[PDB]
Amino acid sequence: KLMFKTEGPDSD
Amino acid sequence: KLMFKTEGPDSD
Amino acid sequence: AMGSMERASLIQKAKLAEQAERYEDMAAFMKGAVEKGEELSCEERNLLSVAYKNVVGGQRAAWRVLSSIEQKSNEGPEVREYREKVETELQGVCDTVLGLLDSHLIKEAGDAESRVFYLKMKGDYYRYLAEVATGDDKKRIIDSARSAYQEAMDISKKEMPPTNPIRLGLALNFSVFHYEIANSPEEAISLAKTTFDEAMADLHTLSEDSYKDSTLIMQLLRDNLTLWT
Amino acid sequence: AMGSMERASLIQKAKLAEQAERYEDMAAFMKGAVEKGEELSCEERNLLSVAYKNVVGGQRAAWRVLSSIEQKSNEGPEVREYREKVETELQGVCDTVLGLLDSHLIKEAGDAESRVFYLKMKGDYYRYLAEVATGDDKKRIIDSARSAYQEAMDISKKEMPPTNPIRLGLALNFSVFHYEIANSPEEAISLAKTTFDEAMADLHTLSEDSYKDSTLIMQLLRDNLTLWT
Numbered sequence: 001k002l003m004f005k006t007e008g009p010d011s012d
Numbered sequence: 013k014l015m016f017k018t019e020g021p022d023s024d
Numbered sequence: 025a026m027g028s029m030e031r032a033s034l035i036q037k038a039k040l041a042e043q044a045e046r047y048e049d050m051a052a053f054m055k056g057a058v059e060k061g062e063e064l065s066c067e068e069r070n071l072l073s074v075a076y077k078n079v080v081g082g083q084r085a086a087w088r089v090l091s092s093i094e095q096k097s098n099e100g101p102e103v104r105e106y107r108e109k110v111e112t113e114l115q116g117v118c119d120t121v122l123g124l125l126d127s128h129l130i131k132e133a134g135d136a137e138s139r140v141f142y143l144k145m146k147g148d149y150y151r152y153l154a155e156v157a158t159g160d161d162k163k164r165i166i167d168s169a170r171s172a173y174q175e176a177m178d179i180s181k182k183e184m185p186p187t188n189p190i191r192l193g194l195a196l197n198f199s200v201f202h203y204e205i206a207n208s209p210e211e212a213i214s215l216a217k218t219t220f221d222e223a224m225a226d227l228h229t230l231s232e233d234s235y236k237d238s239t240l241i242m243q244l245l246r247d248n249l250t251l252w253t
Numbered sequence: 254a255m256g257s258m259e260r261a262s263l264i265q266k267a268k269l270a271e272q273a274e275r276y277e278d279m280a281a282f283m284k285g286a287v288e289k290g291e292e293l294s295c296e297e298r299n300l301l302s303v304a305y306k307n308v309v310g311g312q313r314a315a316w317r318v319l320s321s322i323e324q325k326s327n328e329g330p331e332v333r334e335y336r337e338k339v340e341t342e343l344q345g346v347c348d349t350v351l352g353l354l355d356s357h358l359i360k361e362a363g364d365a366e367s368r369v370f371y372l373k374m375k376g377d378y379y380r381y382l383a384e385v386a387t388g389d390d391k392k393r394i395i396d397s398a399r400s401a402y403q404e405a406m407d408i409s410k411k412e413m414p415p416t417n418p419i420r421l422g423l424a425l426n427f428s429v430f431h432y433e434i435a436n437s438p439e440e441a442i443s444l445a446k447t448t449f450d451e452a453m454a455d456l457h458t459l460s461e462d463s464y465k466d467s468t469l470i471m472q473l474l475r476d477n478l479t480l481w482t
């Protein structure tokens with residue numbers, strides 16, 4: 001899936 | 013530490 | 025489980041676990057610190073958030089891999105069973121975090137920087153629950169995420185400048201909630217644009233270091249707007 | 254723990270866990286498959302090895318971070334305590350793998366490709382134990398690693414061509430054992446060089462695909478020799 005930017009660690 | 017090459021996944 | 029370790033030792037070990045990239049340990053140490061019952065400092069709140077974001081992030085990524093395999097298979101029971109296993113563990117982590125926020129981090133948080141932080145977290149972990157939910161359950165979970173984000177937004181607009189990184193990160197995440205959870209892409213775009221523009225106009229007030237902190241998150245808003253328009 | 258799941262379902266879920274980068278799950282599924290009591294196929298042996306190599310690799314990396322912080326601190330008790338915690342969990346994983354090899358993978362392995370594979374694994378997990386051991390305990394652990402690697406070497410030289418990837422990976426790992434566990438850098442260099450040269454001369458027998466498999470591991474021998482000379 002295209003994941004959009006959210007706050008904090010890009011851990012997924 | 014400098015880790016040398018060992019077989020399989022470089023998981024460390 | 026951490027009832028026998030000193031609060032300060034739990035925080036110290038959370039920082040060590042972070043350095044060692046042992047995020048399940050880090051989250052357990054910070055859960056123990058929360059359960060001591062004292063409020064958390066700014067650094068401690070961020071340790072709590074970083075720990076659980078890393079744990080739940082791995083679970084979300086795994087769930088998406090398995091869900092994709094499952095959908096293709098539906099174009100034995102093992103894929104569904106294992107997706108369900110990961111899903112249940114993910115829901116358990118979200119429930120644990122929400123439990124900490126409800127018992128009793130939010131109710132003791134009076135300053136805007138703590139209260140907004142925790143209400144944003146509440147929105148985030150309901151959002152992660154929503155990503156794997158279906159049906160009526162999903163609608164109520166989505167409403168819970170929206171309600172937490174909205175209370176956080178209301179406080180942040182009254183009590184924080186537009187460049188405040190907590191306020192910016194809240195707006196970022198609430199805009200993603202709108203885009204892909206609430207199926208409100210126009211609301212997502214409007215919120216990201218307005219947030220970005222109001223922050224731009226307040227950058228003149230910032231030091232060099234604060235400018236870097238705020239513009240970093242502003243770039244994430246821009247990244248999303250570029251994908252969305 | 255996996256006694257109620259079908260062997261074939263455990264293998265299927267191990268492959269899914271691999272795709273999802275859930276290596277603790279993958280290792281538990283493969284432990285369950287081993288404990289069904291049947292021998293493992295070539296693919297299944299590699300799933301077992303990949304799973305535990307990933308688990309123990311994270312633990313080794315964390316242990317090294319914590320050990321480094323600890324040594325600097327010794328130039329409160331929390332760093333030592335947490336290093337000990339990770340160390341004990343690492344030793345537990347190694348003991349689990351060694352337990353599977355002893356009960357009863359090695360004794361039922363008669364073909365060279367299975368027996369060499371498992372004896373190499375036995376050397377590897379004693380080697381990981383040796384990395385965190387001290388004193389007399391360390392000497393006996395080192396001897397156990399050496400003994401397993403040596404039996405594997407003897408079989409591999411009698412029963413496998415010099416380009417066989419299992420034989421090559423065994424020689425690679427045994428050479429690293431010599432270099433940094435046994436404090437025998439000259440033995441390490443000699444073994445890596447001889448292994449590389451004898452494989453070179455046997456490449457002419459290989460298909461395009463086998464050539465790629467063998468030269469990949471040969472490059473790892475070269476990488477080490479470049480660092481060592």
Ligand SMILES: COc1ccc(C(=O)NCCN)c2cc(C(=N)N)sc12
Binds near residue numbers: 070
């Ligand atoms: C913006 O969030 C943070 C603010 C402050 C700190 C901090 O260390 N000290 C300042 C005391 N107020 C911190 C440490 C994090 C970490 N270990 N990932 S995040 C994070």
Ligand SMILES: COc1ccc(C(=O)NCCN)c2cc(C(=N)N)sc12
Binds near residue numbers: 271295299300303
């Ligand atoms: C060299 O090692 C392997 C050999 C074979 C396979 C395999 O799939 N199928 C062939 C049946 N003999 C395999 C799959 C791995 C994995 N999932 N990481 S390793 C690995």
Ligand SMILES: [Cl-]
Binds near residue numbers: 105106109266
């Ligand atoms: Cl399962």
Ligand SMILES: [Cl-]
Binds near residue numbers: 037335338
């Ligand atoms: Cl500990």
Ligand SMILES: [Mg+2]
Binds near residue numbers: 210
């Ligand atoms: Mg429009």
Ligand SMILES: [Mg+2]
Binds near residue numbers: 439
């Ligand atoms: Mg010499």
